[PDB]
């Protein structure tokens, strides 16, 4: 068992139940994270929004530093602790098969660029802001599949796919020797809507004689159809490495698995003046 | 094995059918088999309507599973003359290409259309002989795959080498049959179908002639692409009505006003359409020259006099007619095209506007806004009535008597 | 019983239907539903459809979804949740129902499918998400392209090469493939040959359905999915029609969909107002000023320009096309050419038709080249075949064509438009594909020159046959008037000021006051008189139309104006037929004929010089000033 | 959708043919008869329109539709003649058609000793249909014969309108009370809008005192057929209450309300919408609404007060 991974999951559960922002208009101790879970039950949502500034204000920012440095390693631990808080409050959001909940972080400090993408930042929470050029269609993805064998007839549930159609090598029934025959069960598999967005550099950054670089940004969760072509959006996610399936020397490709898209061009006509006045000092 | 005893009664039934069928005290099937020996043409044209009057059980078993009765027919013909090809001729209803559902699979169907193009000659293995690499064991394998095009799973029991010296091969040619445009509805594109020939059935038709082909509708793995194996290539009240109408001296005035009744006046223009649809006489000189019998009429004038309405009336009146435009038809539309198959890596020909409409009227719209590279192919088809294309090493001449 | 079937004791809905004790009770209730259900008049709606199915030799049984939910809810809730196991059991129910009335039906067809139509919930291609997976969703759109009828595989029977035995039958799925490892007679892993004698094939066709142009929001791109047609559903949807695909939203896994960086299996196709809205059309059209109310309602965001609103309103309804003894096809689409100086809201009229007409494709003259308007023969990057992609004139069948900047066009694109304005067909023969598609639509262009001393043949960069195909020639002249500038400036400011239940009702009341007839009622009024009401030309003044064209052609020769051919005479009947459609009448009276002549006269007199405008207005003032 | 055509001269052999056609197409189509040239001359006495009410003359129901009903002659204190001389001549000519139609449809059922009593008092009255320069109306009598061309439609079970046109033919229509006589073996069919606004109709009427099988003992034909004919104001209280008694116009929308609501979520219950409780709620809704009509006997289904927000 991961000793460091269990400590982050235990601290993440208490952050969503003890943090509360005091309102300036009413003066009542209202919990923003507790009220956000109740709002996801009426609208039937599966994506939460957690601000990074609230994580740094607790325990002297000890929890926000472990997530911003190693985000891919603590990714299954953050999703496991979130399901425990939802089950305690509103357990009706689990039955659809269990629903897949994703965490979308917003309002990030440092906003990196495309030229600053290096190999040392692989597996850390970054923020890349660019212009959207080309977008793909809305297609599902095989997340947690279920393989059923033909000999032992065992339903192997909770089968993760690391960007490849992976199959189980052994059947849980000890009275079987099947290492190839496997059938995919669509009625017991968890599907997620993924979309690849090819972003480019910003229009305001026009340097000297250089080549325009592109980055394949993969969106998951409720981030589908959120980055329209022609609008500069602020992406947020982790830098993943997607290999070449057609070649299966292994060639790799630098990707960016984002989880939240913030449109800069987008942000009641009277509310447009109170936002710009409050965002400044 | 019950199939061994049933196969003996089928072969014996076909042997006695030829030695007993007679018409007007004359043996047609017996005289056709004896005359083919001196000519040395292993073929026999057996009509499908003659098997109905002889035995109803024979015609029923042939139309049900022809993949097993046809190979048994070739063995009975050779026993009488002592491999002969069986040619089946049907004179029943013509089934269109659009009415070929899943109920006609492995059944004798009759088609009628114009051949699009013709591929080259291909060799088909029938009696293969393999030889081992260690003990050098020579064994002969008889390929009885009648419903097959290519080598679908070659039987190889593989240290065996197929001997190309002591092996028999037969001829095989691929064809492309298109449905009749008279039955194709408006707003739709006529489909095609790939056929296969064997033995004397290769190099017999001309890409641009309407013939009747009776074959078996089947499928093969390449979702599967269908195919039809070619087996044989082929009132009194209505005649009296046409003879009495020709005797009327006012026939030249009746057919003139009947063609395109929307356009008023212009008796000299409507009179040329009757002479254009009839045409002259295709005379063939004994020296080797051919005279042009088709009439070409060019229209010109100010727009607004129903120019496009007159061209659409001729297409609906003439049996064989293909409507085309000016800029919408390039070199691959007006003439024949040379396309490459991405599956077999072979260059196959394709019919165009002046190729599929052989023997009819080709209505072209906007002849003044045409290009210069497409004007050379039209001038060659208006004098010699032929299309000579020598591209990609393919020198084929197609008749264009439009 | 029906009470024990509601208590779902399984973990999922697909597991409860597959139970033997549940499937036997479901098929039992479905058998009595097709024999005991009666309509409001005391007649069995499903009893008559069974007898008519065997007489026509069909395998499609239409079952209304609204008639099933009003009786038993157990058979209606499980159909929208798991339509896979529900359609398989109900298919055998319809087969047993036809055997009772016609026992000799098993020799023709072996399986009878069910055509489910009329769905309560309607969804589009953009609202397709992960929650609609494995559910019958009714999606409506326009068919763009389609494939051929390829025989699919269902019951494949393989043959062994080591013994000669037949292995099968095996159900072939459209997602995975059958891979036989061991045999049942020789136990070997040799190659198996597919027998072409004992395999039951089926029809298969892939049709790409796109969203309708009247439902796509402005500023976005339309979406398209893939529709699979099986059994007798093929050869039904044609490229250029509006159908309602009522299939199941499934998904397929592809090997190239994961390394480079949603198929809907149809079940029933139906080609395309209520009873309360039909009675309201006769009450409004009964007034004597119904024609003036429609002209004032056309483009409410533009003040003035009453002569241009009469041409756009007549082009939306169109004429009545009819064949002449199977020889000629007279067109009925009114072609309007918007000409004049830019700045008079010329491009704003084209955007109004795209949001009101049932099928309007907006195009331009700069971006749209040769293939941007007509069809094309492109190569597919997947199947490596020469496909056929539609253009602006191909995807706008029986609709309105909107082309911007008609003067800035190439010579190769002007000839293709003239060829489609007379025969209403675009013949394209490229890459050996000789196809003659149809193109019947009202082309409403808007070019830019306007010198009043010069005629229309010199101001507009066009030819003579191009200008002759247009029925109405609208000419706008930017004049100087202090009275018109005050009324136009007030309407602009009034339209920019006004740009939770009490706030929404106040916004709808301000929009209806500025249009005075609402916009939602005008959209359904045009489509109602275009597919049901067809006015005729019975009892009309044939001598009056001959005298108008005789005086119009005699004045254009002595003055040297635009020559009037025979195409201008047929444009009067097209405008007169459109006026009768606005009044919901089946006959064109003398009032509609006098209004169609004034439109052609005003479009021809104003399209000349200054000296010709002051001369033709005095001689042709008798036909315009009606009694 | 089959429209058979058979001559009536051969029937006076074709008895079981019409008996098997009233179940599918129901509406029969005749053709030639004894009246040919005199049928077109009846329009001379059609442009009258000069009679008041008292169940006679035109009925100005408001607006462009009217029904010129002409009462019979033997009925006392219910006569109002005018200038319809051609209408009275066809009253006796078409009277034989009503008796001959029973010999080819009612004769095959049981016997013929019952159809002679319904067509004996001659109490039927014609109804002339006119339009000035259409709601789904149900037939009043049991038999309805009317010469026309189109007009009729279908409200062949594809819920679609069928506009047929047969020149020189007679279109027959079946009533509503005739279905209950044949334990449900008939189907009604209304009309539709058409440019031809000149059609003559004729509906027969059973006698006032006649039994209606066994289920029509307490309710005769005079009490049942007079309900749909008086809803077009004496009595005025009984005419308004009969129009509001049609509970199907408000109870049919409830059977589909919860069906379209539970489908989007798949109510006080949390476990969706079971079929055992959904069918019980429909029977309880028709039972609760039945007590509202029983305790009120002019209610036009009033609305309830919506829950307003506080402050």
Swiss-Prot record, chain A:
It is found in: Nucleus. It comes from the Eukaryota. The modification Phosphoserine is found at residue 210. Acts as a component of the MCM2-7 complex (MCM complex) which is the putative replicative helicase essential for 'once per cell cycle' DNA replication initiation and elongation in eukaryotic cells. The active ATPase sites in the MCM2-7 ring are formed through the interaction surfaces of two neighboring subunits such that a critical structure of a conserved arginine finger motif is provided in trans relative to the ATP-binding site of the Walker A box of the adjacent subunit. The six ATPase active sites, however, are likely to contribute differentially to the complex helicase activity. Belongs to the MCM family. Component of the MCM2-7 complex. The complex forms a toroidal hexameric ring with the proposed subunit order MCM2-MCM6-MCM4-MCM7-MCM3-MCM5; loaded onto DNA, forms a head-head double hexamer. Interacts with MCM10. Present with 13400 molecules/cell in log phase SD medium. Early fractionation of eukaryotic MCM proteins yielded a variety of dimeric, trimeric and tetrameric complexes with unclear biological significance. Specifically a MCM467 subcomplex is shown to have in vitro helicase activity which is inhibited by the MCM2 subunit. The MCM2-7 hexamer is the proposed physiological active complex. This is DNA replication licensing factor MCM6. The chain holds residues 104 to 509 of 1017 of the full protein.
Swiss-Prot record, chain C:
It comes from the Eukaryota. Its EC number is 3.6.4.12. Changing residue 211 to K: In allele MCM2-1. Residues 290-493 form the MCM domain. One of its GO terms (molecular function) is DNA replication origin binding. One of its GO terms (biological process) is double-strand break repair via break-induced replication. It catalyses: ATP + H2O = ADP + phosphate + H(+). Changing residue 469 to A: Loss of MCM2-7 complex helicase activity. The keyword Cell cycle applies. It is found in: Nucleus. GO terms for cellular component: CMG complex; cytoplasm; DNA replication preinitiation complex; MCM complex; nuclear pre-replicative complex; nuclear replication fork; nucleoplasm; nucleus. A zinc finger (C4-type) spans 160-186. Keywords: ATP-binding, Cell cycle, DNA replication, DNA-binding, Helicase, Hydrolase, Metal-binding, Nucleotide-binding, Nucleus, Phosphoprotein, Zinc, Zinc-finger. Its main location: nucleus. Changing residue 183 to Y/F/S/H: Loss of activity. Belongs to the MCM family. Acts as a component of the MCM2-7 complex (MCM complex) which is the putative replicative helicase essential for 'once per cell cycle' DNA replication initiation and elongation in eukaryotic cells. The active ATPase sites in the MCM2-7 ring are formed through the interaction surfaces of two neighboring subunits such that a critical structure of a conserved arginine finger motif is provided in trans relative to the ATP-binding site of the Walker A box of the adjacent subunit. Component of the MCM2-7 complex. The complex forms a toroidal hexameric ring with the proposed subunit order MCM2-MCM6-MCM4-MCM7-MCM3-MCM5; loaded onto DNA, forms a head-head double hexamer. Present with 1690 molecules/cell in log phase SD medium. This is DNA replication licensing factor MCM2. It comes from Saccharomyces cerevisiae (strain ATCC 204508 / S288c) (Baker's yeast). The lineage of its organism: Eukaryota, Fungi, Dikarya, Ascomycota, Saccharomycotina. The chain holds residues 182 to 868 of 868 of the full protein.
